[PDB]
Amino acid sequence: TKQYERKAKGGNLLSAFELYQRNSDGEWFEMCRDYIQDGHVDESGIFRPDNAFYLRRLTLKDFRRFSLLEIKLEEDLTVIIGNNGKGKTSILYAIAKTLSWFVANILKEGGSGQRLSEMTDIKNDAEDRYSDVSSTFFFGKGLKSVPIRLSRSALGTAERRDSEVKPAKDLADIWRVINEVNTINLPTFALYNVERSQPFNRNIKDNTGRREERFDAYSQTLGGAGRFDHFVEWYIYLHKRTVSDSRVLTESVQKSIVEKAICSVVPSISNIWVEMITGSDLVKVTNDGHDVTIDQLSDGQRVFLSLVADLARRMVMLNPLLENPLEGRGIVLIDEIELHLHPKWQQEVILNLRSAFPNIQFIITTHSPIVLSTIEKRCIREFEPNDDGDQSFLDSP
Amino acid sequence: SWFVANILKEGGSGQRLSEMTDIKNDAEDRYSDVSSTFFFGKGLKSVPIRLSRSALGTAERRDSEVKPAKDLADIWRVINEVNTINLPTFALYNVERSQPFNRNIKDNTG
Amino acid sequence: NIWVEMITGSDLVKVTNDGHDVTIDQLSDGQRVFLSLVADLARRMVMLNPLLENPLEGRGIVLIDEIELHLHPKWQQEVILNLRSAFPNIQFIITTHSPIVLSTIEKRCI
Amino acid sequence: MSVIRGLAAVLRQSDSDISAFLVTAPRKYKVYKIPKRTTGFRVIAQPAKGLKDIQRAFVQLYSLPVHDASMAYMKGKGIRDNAAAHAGNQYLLKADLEDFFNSITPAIFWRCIEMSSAQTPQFEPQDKLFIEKILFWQPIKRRKTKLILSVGAPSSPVISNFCMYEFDNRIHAACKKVEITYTRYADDLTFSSNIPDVLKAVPSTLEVLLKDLFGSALRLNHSKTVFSSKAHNRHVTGITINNEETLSLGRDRKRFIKHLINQYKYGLLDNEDKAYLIGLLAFASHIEPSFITRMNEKYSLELMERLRG
RNA sequence: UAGUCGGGUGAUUAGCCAGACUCUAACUUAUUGAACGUAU
Numbered sequence A: 001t002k003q004y005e006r007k008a009k010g011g012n013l014l015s016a017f018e019l020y021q022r023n024s025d026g027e028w029f030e031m032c033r034d035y036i037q038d039g040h041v042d043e044s045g046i047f048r049p050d051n052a053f054y055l056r057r058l059t060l061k062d063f064r065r066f067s068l069l070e071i072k073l074e075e076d077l078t079v080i081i082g083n084n085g086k087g088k089t090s091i092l093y094a095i096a097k098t099l100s101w102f103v104a105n106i107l108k109e110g111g112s113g114q115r116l117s118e119m120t121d122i123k124n125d126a127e128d129r130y131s132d133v134s135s136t137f138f139f140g141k142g143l144k145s146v147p148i149r150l151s152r153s154a155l156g157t158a159e160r161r162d163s164e165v166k167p168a169k170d171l172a173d174i175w176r177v178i179n180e181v182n183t184i185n186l187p188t189f190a191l192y193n194v195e196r197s198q199p200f201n202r203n204i205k206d207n208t209g210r211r212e213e214r215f216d217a218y219s220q221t222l223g224g225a226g227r228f229d230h231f232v233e234w235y236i237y238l239h240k241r242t243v244s245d246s247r248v249l250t251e252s253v254q255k256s257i258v259e260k261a262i263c264s265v266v267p268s269i270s271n272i273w274v275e276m277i278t279g280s281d282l283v284k285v286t287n288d289g290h291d292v293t294i295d296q297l298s299d300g301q302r303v304f305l306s307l308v309a310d311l312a313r314r315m316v317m318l319n320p321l322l323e324n325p326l327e328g329r330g331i332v333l334i335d336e337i338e339l340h341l342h343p344k345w346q347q348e349v350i351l352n353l354r355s356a357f358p359n360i361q362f363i364i365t366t367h368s369p370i371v372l373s374t375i376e377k378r379c380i381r382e383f384e385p386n387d388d389g390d391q392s393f394l395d396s397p
Numbered sequence B: 001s002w003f004v005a006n007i008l009k010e011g012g013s014g015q016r017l018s019e020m021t022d023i024k025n026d027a028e029d030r031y032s033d034v035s036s037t038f039f040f041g042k043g044l045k046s047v048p049i050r051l052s053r054s055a056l057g058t059a060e061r062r063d064s065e066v067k068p069a070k071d072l073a074d075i076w077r078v079i080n081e082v083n084t085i086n087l088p089t090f091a092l093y094n095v096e097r098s099q100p101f102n103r104n105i106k107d108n109t110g
Numbered sequence C: 001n002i003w004v005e006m007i008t009g010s011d012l013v014k015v016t017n018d019g020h021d022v023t024i025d026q027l028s029d030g031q032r033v034f035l036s037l038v039a040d041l042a043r044r045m046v047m048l049n050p051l052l053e054n055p056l057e058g059r060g061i062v063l064i065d066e067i068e069l070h071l072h073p074k075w076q077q078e079v080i081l082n083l084r085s086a087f088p089n090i091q092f093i094i095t096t097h098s099p100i101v102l103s104t105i106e107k108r109c110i
Numbered sequence D: 001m002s003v004i005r006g007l008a009a010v011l012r013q014s015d016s017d018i019s020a021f022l023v024t025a026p027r028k029y030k031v032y033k034i035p036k037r038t039t040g041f042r043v044i045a046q047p048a049k050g051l052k053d054i055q056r057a058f059v060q061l062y063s064l065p066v067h068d069a070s071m072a073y074m075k076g077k078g079i080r081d082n083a084a085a086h087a088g089n090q091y092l093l094k095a096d097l098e099d100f101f102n103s104i105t106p107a108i109f110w111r112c113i114e115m116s117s118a119q120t121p122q123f124e125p126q127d128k129l130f131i132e133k134i135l136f137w138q139p140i141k142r143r144k145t146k147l148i149l150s151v152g153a154p155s156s157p158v159i160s161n162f163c164m165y166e167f168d169n170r171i172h173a174a175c176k177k178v179e180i181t182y183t184r185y186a187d188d189l190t191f192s193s194n195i196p197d198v199l200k201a202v203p204s205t206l207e208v209l210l211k212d213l214f215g216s217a218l219r220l221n222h223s224k225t226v227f228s229s230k231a232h233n234r235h236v237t238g239i240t241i242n243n244e245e246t247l248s249l250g251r252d253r254k255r256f257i258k259h260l261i262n263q264y265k266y267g268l269l270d271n272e273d274k275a276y277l278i279g280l281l282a283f284a285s286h287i288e289p290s291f292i293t294r295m296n297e298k299y300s301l302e303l304m305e306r307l308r309g
Numbered sequence E: 001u002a003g004u005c006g007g008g009u010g011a012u013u014a015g016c017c018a019g020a021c022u023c024u025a026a027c028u029u030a031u032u033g034a035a036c037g038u039a040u
């Protein structure tokens, strides 16, 4: 026993929670809660937490077209460049499956994550017929490393490889158990790919779940396209209450925060509201100085609005104790950032997002040169024109 | 439903409770249970079962308990494949039984 | 190259793509979409003109929106000439917002 | 000549009782759990009393070759010798192996004893039955064909050094031609040099040589390769190297030792922490002996000789 | 710029004072067994 006390008094996180559970079965509870909550306001008026959370390194062995590969990532922004057939989508697919083991263990004790397919993800001519993926995360000077591995063997072979997932369960239990006694702010995870472009209709609703309770924010968050049909239903619920005229916020404040972010980021929308005088409920916007319903917008306009609106709702529900909810921790993945955008909008998208969301880590890809024209040179990674699965490390220009 | 599934095939699974309809709206325990007990003569006088569920985001979890029910259904299935026996019946008739009759019985299958 | 093959008592399609052999579900999105346009248009003309020495020399009208979708800069520079070389007698109406595509077309057509 | 007479003579017992006991020498083990320093358990198995005596006796009758670059489980040497050899070089590399003990089986041993570059001893063909029943563990009761080498048994260290003999022999001779230094502990590999862009090639060379000697049986753990230089932290088997090219206990451990002496000055310390403090000072004297000369200056020699055992 | 090494005060695992260094590039670990340092 004395060994845990000599570690805990030195500032180690995992030894403090071990004493709390063993002795509860109040000195050790406050050490756990303060490590998660401490921070200060900088000279520009932005809140910054004492302990950050992010990904440091990735590695791949006999996976799709790669024999062996390594890559190192930046704490703020990273951008990948190339042509058709070079592996850009296949990298984001490997990261997204790894994050699913955290989300499953915040919702339920002893939950289950996603798998690799034994039919299509193994390399076609590899002699040993199995594949592996490996990662490493950071969470401040209380614990400087957290490792994970996923693996699988080809269809019809006689010997099976195993995964190693326990270190992810150990961290996710601290966030789940401390939050039930007292309250804390929680992290965000999301993926957007090319399945975002789709048509819109009004005759639709879900009879599963409730759209006003805190844990709905994690529902279908790694699926590839956001549930914009849940945003409309939630925004109408806020209206019907506020019309009847600690640190939690009232529906009147929550409604005001979201409307300001939408008008600030999208170049050509200037106001939005709900109305219901005719017998039914509708959403209206002002666009080029004219007045329209959402179904009259062009595809380039609807796609950009749909992305910005869904992220803001999740940020506001998960951080109930901050003064400005858009400043919490998290990780976000986006593929093909210029889909449907005119060349005058393409050259300025990235810097608006980094202004509106100051503490998130972004990972992004593209195949056009105009988007880079304002970025610094330590944020960029690029493939060889000469490669055929030989390049074993990705590098800057 | 747990007896019927185990007579037909090895392993198998029954039905389960629903998290958004069946749990009482304001109970501070945040979980719900249903419990039963059967009899099968002087040599096997008690067989208990429990079904359970709980709300999402809690510190702990509740599971079901069903092993004593699987054990009895395996005896009926294993003995019958060696030498034939009689088997039990289970049924439910609801208010939905009153509906019209379709005279075109053209459908055929083997 | 492209051909039909049989494995495990089932038929399936193979292609050779930049040096290696694959199934259709392994291609990138910029490769699939471009294949899907050309394969559909060729069938319909082969079925409709049975009495020409080359079925693809018949007549008609075709509409296309957003030619630049999923293509990188070196391909979107040249796609128009390859289509017009393969279907000599069709009338085309086309739309775009990228000025690279225009860099090989005469001023009357715009 | 034969092992059974040799054991019976050295143990001073009748030889029929040796052959009667050895029939089921596998399965004579006890199993238990020990805690990790952060959270969780490690699982250990140890051979039953009396089977220990046969193992200690066997390693008297025979001897096997060992290369100079090995640093563990050998007499006279220790971890300070391993740390001292790299202390002059400004660049560093490290690597590791999967499942080092459990990966060894009788088929590996009987190949290595035969194909050797060195003077292995001869044996009677019929003694192989008794040799296998002395050296290996059967973990699963029904799968009677599984035999593996346990970490908890007195004979295992020697056998684990012998199996590496040709790997150490070749890689050291290769590094000497290019100005690179090599040493190996139980299962750590360490490389260093004083010129740039030479260390980048090495990981590829190891992976070829491993499959050439062992085939599928042992492999490199890809998740643990690390590079460092004079611009970042450097350590070897728990010992730190400073920018003045000398060995160190590190600032954080020095400051923690100062606190415990200050508790003793005012009589606040108690018997458990007093015993622990004496054990640390006995260790610290071997690695950084100039530290004690400063401690009996900041505190009186009078107080220091009272604390000392 | 920011990281990393550590001589000195300091009821001392904190804070503060002084002086140094850069190959894309450290993350402190396990007994009752084996080897080593110190008692007995």
Ligand SMILES: Nc1ncnc2c1ncn2[C@@H]1O[C@H](COP(=O)(O)OP(=O)(O)OP(=O)(O)O)[C@@H](O)[C@H]1O
Pocket: A064, A065, A083, A084, A085, A086, A087, A088, A089, A090, A091, A120, A121, A122, A123, A124, C017, C022, C026, C027, C028, C029, C030
């Ligand atoms: N199992 C496999 N074995 C070998 N090659 C494969 C395998 N699976 C896919 N490929 C190769 O993967 C490449 C496409 O990879 P991916 O779709 O990730 O690249 P991408 O072009 O950058 O994607 P995108 O631009 O749409 O984001 C193709 O060249 C294809 O031949």
Ligand SMILES: [Mg+2]
Pocket: none
């Ligand atoms: Mg000991």
